[model samples]
Target: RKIDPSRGATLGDGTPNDNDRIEIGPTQLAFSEWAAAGLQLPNLDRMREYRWKRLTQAIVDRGYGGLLMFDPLNIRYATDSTNMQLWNTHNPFRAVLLCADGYMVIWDYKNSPFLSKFNPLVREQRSGADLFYFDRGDKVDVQADVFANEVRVLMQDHAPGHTRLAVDKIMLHGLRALEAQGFEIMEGEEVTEKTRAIKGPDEILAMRCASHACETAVAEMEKFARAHVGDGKTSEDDIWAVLHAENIKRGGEWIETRLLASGPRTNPWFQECGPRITQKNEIIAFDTDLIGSYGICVDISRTWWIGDQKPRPDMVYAMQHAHEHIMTNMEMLKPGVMIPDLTANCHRLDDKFQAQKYGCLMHGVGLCDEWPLVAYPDKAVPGSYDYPLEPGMVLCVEAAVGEVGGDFSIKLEDQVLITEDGYENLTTYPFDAALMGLA
Candidate 1:
């Protein structure tokens, strides 16, 4: 089912755009209930300002002059500015400079200053370093030198007497060029990650909308996969493509990973979707990492059986453990809880499945899978760290089971917000009823 772009999708509401080609049918759109209940959409202006304030505060905490951010995600956090998001990850043509005193500047691609019109925090937009090698092989360092000079002047005007600059994701030439400007470069992730870890009220509202959008699309995929089991000749790629299409058509940006796998491929996990044939009762597992409305991401997982044939005994065994694992850890979430405690006391997979354990017990999520990735007590996960869980922090608790050399694998994850009193699950999608033995 394809939502026609011509139908003008709900720009203000949660309904997916529909036309003659695709009958969205009784499949409810994300946030339909919330929007219908009259809860207001997040105030965009306030959200942007709060993000700027958070970034600036984080920078000041580090005693730095300002943060020079080249990562598209970091730029979005600082100035609420975006251009060619995925492309920028490769070309890195856009950046933002946010001083501790709150002065912010955006380096957008040439002639795209209007991109930041809605972002009140952006002082101004200008062409950033023209040094990417693909643009012009030679003189890359020379171009970086030019941009460095602009930065030196900007910092001098705004953060006078400050010598330390927290820089994130800069090319070698640009890094050296900035050094030439007599500023010491520190890791910018410290500020950016910590700032993004916390979600303000408006950000939570935006997150809720994104989560709704994600689940709504998921419902469509679930229906499509089940209905076309043998009739529609649905292949793995066939089902996976529905998610991408539904996400983009409904104001979502993109899916970060190809985590859709089916049948035997679902056993080991991490398998990308492809042309694998699908039939009755095969397991399909996918993790939703769709960067949705306002750059908010819903990082959740669901494993479904393709057809209504009752889930096999092996499937139910794995599914029961997955559900229990998710709930056990999710119940541990609340303000003031320590990470080490969670990891130490968290549920552990049985020895049979320990060898195939999924990444971490849980991880943080924001513009993408972010910081404070809480690890299992025995494993040292890169980028995972220990800290106290706090209010306004959104997280995803992960669970999976595929006994070593076993035939079935089950993956489950839930996104939740750590509240003042406890945690709230941002994910509204339900697990497979058959797999959970409900059917």
Candidate 2:
């Protein structure tokens, strides 16, 4: 079946059309105007139903009687139930059993009244100890057994003759428990990943709102950074504080990381926010690991100059190279392009330039970083990097390059959505014109 961009690409009553883009209003009026008037947000009930429609179709296509999801992100995607999102990353307190026939169950913390507030589509709820606490270390195995038995009974009642189950993950104890129950299990990673890679109109609306908020935050940070230029005393935390405050001011939820680095720290990359003071004429860069409105992750990176000093030749060279790399490569992001082929075709600076680059050429993004990462050419594992680009897939194209053994680096990133015609740049934040050699 052809992918449907409107209804989250499920196998249902949706036609593939180029005009399916959800019209999120202009950035200025997006937040306050729509939110205050209660007119811009998506229909949550309809959105959840669409997601389930896609998930159920995926289960049947894979010949599974049901899907068992332990991954918190997958669980959220499946049931639209959320509590302690960040805490659940390390703790496995909740799970969802979604059958091919559309029946559902949620396994939450024992005696938690919050479970009752979940989706009415969930037909049953089972509770156990909170993931944050342990009743007894020895009981861990018994807990897995109980959960597996519950799953077994669910399958017997809902799926019956269709006994094969697809699971996102299973601990050894749970695996053994399922084995004891004589159930055939299959890996369910693809079903969820593929479903998530392509977004629905509702998801597109949420992400666009997130992208706008992110741009707003970045602009505020840039304003602060620009105003503080040449003092040679602005700390990384000072600039990051502006970013944090602005995101919160715009109703964003959390930041995954504040990877803001100035001067020497930018070269190595991934040096999260630190106490380093800004220096005149040096480059400062950051990756905004922000999770914004509706729980969408807005990831975009940029580099800036600290003061009015003209960028040194090396700095200009690195920025120009990175900018060119992203601009040139983004043109080919249409459907039918294979990932590995794109990676192979991407431009790279010559070795004599003494440049070191990092990260993939492109990657999928949804609630968080999704799947089908197109690895940097040197890091590609032959057969693994070959996935086809598809319409409705939102992606982040990345470019980072620094002088080898030097103190500063340059990075540029943008978010784009694949469309029937080509691609749309979702992130409206412009690159630093001076750094881009546009000045």
Candidate 3:
């Protein structure tokens, strides 16, 4: 198939690039038809539902005009009914403008041809017209002033006389736009976050699929590496690049820069791509963890043996022990469970295996890598400690170990959900030490 890296893969400029791997196949219409039949099995609908309600209330409670939803994550949550395959980078260029009367209007960007695949939540928006770009210092830029003034003048057709205006923090450059429009902007940051914190069943399902895809790719690529890479001849950079490509081919791209640390490079939390190569019998830390969406981050770690010798027993046990501890503690997740308590328990459990010399136990995983994080003093933004885990919260629990010696290390992770009853392991991949051995 033709490789279209315009979507997911990045170019040398560090900008968001797209990958046109999936052809505009016959399946597009079929999938759209099926999605129209409500085939979307989203994992965490409650999170979005909760946020929508909060958004409705905030629009009124905060006493402002309806919000102009703009943040990428916020926009995706509001509109995606699980049919959004390109969830991470490709957000529907749409806007949700809420009114104080609990009603909202959506404007869908018409230029992007690919939006045909967006879920019903997106397409349901009123189709937008051709929008042009204009900025200050240009004639058309001030012409935009006239255009916006006309938009305000036309607002009388929708809501008359009321001057209440509220905007979500998700909207980048919204403050500037709002200021230009001369409307009062209120704080919607917390309002927006509280809306996204909880997840729904379908959202959870998508995340599980993402995790499954990630594990599948990781296993397949490791198999390839086992057969092909050896003798320390394979440079670390090559292995990293190949694994990244291999992961994407298998349907799960690395959530960040793939880490392939050989020997000393494995000591710190390194995410850089370098030219270092791997050697035989050396300890190399391979972590290709990723987060495509809710409940969809890969958190698996493996230590590869490139030479004929086996890894030191201590290194093996330390990693295995840490993995077990993390798995055990993750199983303890339930509604009303505190993050600090979870962190404390993981630390105590790690002590049993002498494995507390690295990063903290685990953290939340949905949109970002370092969110709802669980650390020594890890807390939610601009706050002290996070609230207890509620149902619909999917967390990526990671247990990492770095022993005194540098033979090898293991950083194992898995996505789990805190349901009303208890925890559910979304990732079904095996965390076997034998798997790291030559197959």
Candidate 4:
């Protein structure tokens, strides 16, 4: 494996193409469009300051003493510091305590205190988190007690008599211990979600770059899949793996789901990519739940036909409706637009495909999907609520078209940012020309 790089590798240069090169539209890849897009990268300091202000102001407005966040995304917003995010979601190791008075404290993994240094908003970092069961089995109560006491002491110093605390995703015993110490717990998700919904200039720039990376990868995957269409070997997993490789190679983080499916398996949607060998003349579809560069999610869906055989007329019919559904919904976004109006007025599929409509009309995306969920009225989940769209909010408009129990589905989506005047479609990947009957 350590053999000569001089043989097949491009050596001196970091990429077969330049490191920042993008090739979504043209055959030429001599330069990066990211530079043209003016996205050098996020200004981490400015972004973190904006996030800190948003969270603290929300805490003050809600009249809470502080925010106790164990949810990984919340911590990421409050401090811009992260380590093992996916693991921390269930493990509950690291914690962030953001006081109303502006003091910020983090209890990081035992030996990883340095992780907090990346963001100045995190004023202090404490060692050891005793909430994980695997660490303190029988002594859970004691650790929870100790943790609550430390929290009480911190609130006593910074927040004083304001005992109302906004907390999200804590161990049951930990909550009980905090309750014993006279802290009234309120759901903190609203605070973080609202704060994250509005992307600052820096965050929006980061998202553009991340979306650019996602499209770049998707382009590679489609090219690779098309070349191997009838080889009797290419699997959905083989094609799906291209996204992960391209993302990781370019400083992006993890992909949240495996949703690439080919042919008949694509009918119901949500089929995770697997080893089924994909053949020519079949439909291939995927939703990229990609958490790309800067921990921002670039979620969009695309469907393709495997071979040069023109897509079936039925598929083309659905494709037309799918494109209309996505485009019409995107046009409906703007600052101050009410969720109810958006939901009630959004594009709807033909009655035959109504039963297979995508679960959401649109959803918020920041570090990951956050708040302000809009559901198709018929598909609305219990307790789903409404809010007005605000400038700087990023959302993904989604659609799936397939008759119930049908043999195939056409799924499409686009990521959009709500602007002061209207909306901007951040996703640039082109639809299949043949499927669109454009070719």
User: On residues 1-439, what C-alpha lDDT tens digit does candidate 4 reach at each position?
Assistant: 2122333432111123232322111112211445565555566667778888888999999989999999988988888777888888778888899999989999999888887775767888895555767977888888898889999999999999999999987888899999999999998887888889999998897788788877888888989989986689988888998888877766677888888999999989888899999988999999998887667889999989868678999999998889999999999999988888888898878999988788888999988887878889887655556678999999999989998889899989999999999999998899988888777
Native-referenced Cα lDDT, model 1: 0.81
lDDT of each: 0.81, 0.75, 0.53, 0.83
After TM-score superposition, what is the CA distance of residue 124 in candidate 2 from its true location, in Å?
2.7
RMSD of 2: 7.3
lDDT of 1 by residue, 220-261 (tens): 888888888655477888988888888876667788998888
Report the lDDT tens digits of candidate 3 across residue range 328-367: 7787789998777776665443443344344555666565
Cα deviation in Å at residue 109, candidate 2? 2.6
TM-score of 2: 0.86
Q: Which window of 10 residues has the lowest lDDT sum in candidate 1?
A: 21-30
C-alpha positional error of residue 3 in candidate 4 after TM-score superposition, expressed in Å = 25
Ranking of all candidate structures by their lDDT, best first: 4, 1, 2, 3
TM-score per model over all chains: 0.91, 0.86, 0.68, 0.91
Runs of candidate 2 with Cα error greater than 4 angstroms are 1-30, 33-40, 111-118, 129-136, 229-233, 352-355
